[PDB]
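User: I'm putting together a small comparison set for a docking exercise, and I want a reference complex before I start. The sequence is below, and the ligand is magnesium ion. Could you produce the 3D structure with the ligand included, as structure tokens?
Assistant: Of course. I'll restate your input first, then give the structure tokens for the complex.
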Amino acid sequence: MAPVQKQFREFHDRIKLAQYDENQTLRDERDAVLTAVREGLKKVFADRGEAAPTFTPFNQGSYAMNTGVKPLEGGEYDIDVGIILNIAKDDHDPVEVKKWIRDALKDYGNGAEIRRSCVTVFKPGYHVDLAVYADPELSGGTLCIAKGKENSGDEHRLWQISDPQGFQDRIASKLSGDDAAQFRRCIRYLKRWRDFRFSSAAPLGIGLTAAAYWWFQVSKRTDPVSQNVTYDDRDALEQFVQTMLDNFHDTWDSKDQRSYPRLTVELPVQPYNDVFEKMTGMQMESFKSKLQALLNALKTAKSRLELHDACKALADHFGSEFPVPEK
Ligand SMILES: Nc1ncnc2c1ncn2[C@H]1C[C@H](O)[C@@H](COP(=O)(O)OP(=O)(O)OP(=O)(O)O)O1
Ligand SMILES: Nc1ncnc2c1ncn2[C@H]1C[C@H](O)[C@@H](COP(=O)(O)OP(=O)(O)OP(=O)(O)O)O1
Ligand SMILES: [Mg+2]
Ligand SMILES: [Mg+2]
């Protein structure tokens, strides 16, 4: 039966996006937005009659963790950055804090918008999500992110304990060397699957990343004699996807009077929230179906005599950058 490891490795080379520490361009676009916020803030606070708050920025998201993928045509890069303002949380509404950042970014690119967990600034072919934190020193020693929107009620405006560094560290440290490499490749493969089969409803990147933290297992073989190591990414995805499917739980929804299959995946650090909690029952059901059809293709791919047929089965789920050799 035809193997597909070479094709997976090539697919990986095509989809991977270099992380911040190796991506001049990303750093520059990041540093530009941070620059705009400092410059912007000087204005917003010259109005108020108070000293501009200072912030310490740090890298977040898949570009910090080396799990980033290139977007498909008409998709956007997602530059995630955190800013820790020299402010005490208990003295400020978090939404009001997010307003400062929005207003400081009013003019920059196609402007800024306040989301539930970040301020997002738009630009040609990318966006920057700024997660906004209060200083742990002035806030009694916890790092809290500014949660809530402009239209959000009172009980939905809050400073939620977070641990982005802890999360990144667990992703980096779960494995090492070529084992960790396979883990990162498998997250990327599933992010392209997400981009290909889900609408611009989609299994978040955070979700698949946390899922992998809990459930990914390396697939490699070590020759008993030569101790030569080869990796089997197809098999790694098969076991990982099967394990995710096994952890779906039929969950009754009283309002709708039916159950939906739901996958719950806790963040392995504070606040230990279910990273999929925002997906609806119906989007979860569709997510489970598509995971099952991906699993079936991963199995099909291992029992094809012809490389063409093995790859084509994979391309139907991973999309047209998955290499299909001619028959
Ligand atoms: N639901 C959540 N719960 C807890 N932390 C989150 C959640 N969503 C996002 N975060 C934090 C951790 C993420 O690595 C970071 C950026 O989120 P996001 O950009 O959605 O994921 P990501 O950068 O790993 O994947 P992607 O490659 O798909 O952009 O913010
Ligand atoms: N704890 C977290 N830390 C950092 N980023 C987070 C966290 N939780 C979610 N995010 C990310 C994921 C999203 O890409 C982005 C916006 O969060 P989200 O809660 O989806 O906003 P939202 O409620 O505006 O979404 P929508 O507009 O679709 O309803 O921030
Ligand atoms: Mg991201
Ligand atoms: Mg993001």
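The first strand starts at residue 55 and ends at 59. The chain is about 45% helix and 15% strand.
User: Thanks, that's exactly what I needed.
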